[PDB]
């Protein structure tokens, strides 16, 4: 029987969060650090994310705005730099690892002057301002929250969307069940589990896409656009 919830795999919630914090504190503040030794795939990832996002920026009744985005688990700002800053007047970043947000100021260069808030906080403790973001981008971090905290965070994100705003989740997906990585202190969930959590948060899918052109050996990666 596969596991369907983080409560089947997390022995101790406080340790699940504390171990993850310690893990990221000792990762280099680099693109390769952000991507776990896969820094080389960054351009494939960004190109796909851009195409995915552009579907929502077309003119019409439901056009997503371009005033402000929120990058969640932003790290040093890989996605902020190459995807979001070019498309959004301002960007806010949130990440648990202070050293990454310090590095971001260097990494982002002159364009980083348009990063407005650098929030150093776990997502589980973060309440984004109501009616503030056109796009909330959550990439390669949902596995660091419990199911309850992920559901709650998505509810809070829903409340922070501007009219026509969207949440995007892009992350590793398990073939089946909920799989603990006890080294980085994270889980990988199957598509059914993730969809269940999204539904629990009062959100709906606008689109879902598998990331192509990745190394064969890694977990599959999917993008979801939600409102």
């Amino acid at each position: 029987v596969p596991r369907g919830s983080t409560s089947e795999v997390i022995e101790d919630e406080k340790q699940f969060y504390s171990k993850a914090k310690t893990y990221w504190k000792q990762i280099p503040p680099t693109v390769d650090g952000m991507l776990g030794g896969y820094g080389h795939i960054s351009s494939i990832d960004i190109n796909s994310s851009r195409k995915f996002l552009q579907r929502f920026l077309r003119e019409g009744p439901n056009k997503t705005g371009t005033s402000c985005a929120l990058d969640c688990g932003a790290g040093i700002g890989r996605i902020t730099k190459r995807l979001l800053l070019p498309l959004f007047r301002e960007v806010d970043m949130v990440d648990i690892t202070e050293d990454f947000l310090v590095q971001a100021k260097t990494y982002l260069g002159e364009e980083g002057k348009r990063v407005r808030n650098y929030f150093c906080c776990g997502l589980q403790d973060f309440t984004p301002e109501p009616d503030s973001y056109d796009v909330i981008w959550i990439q390669w971090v949902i596995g660091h929250l419990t199911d309850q905290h992920l559901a709650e965070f998505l509810r809070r994100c829903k409340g922070s969307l501007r009219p026509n705003g969207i949440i995007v989740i892009k992350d590793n997906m398990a073939q089946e069940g909920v799989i603990l990585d006890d080294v980085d202190s994270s889980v990988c969930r199957d598509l059914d589990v993730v969809r269940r959590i999204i539904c629990s948060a009062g959100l709906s899918l606008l689109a879902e896409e598998r990331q192509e052109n990745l190394p064969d050996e890694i977990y599959h990666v999917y993008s979801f656009a939600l409102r």
Partner: peptide
């Protein structure tokens, strides 16, 4: 991060 299937 992206990572090897365990």
């Amino acid at each position: 991060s992206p990572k090897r299937i365990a």
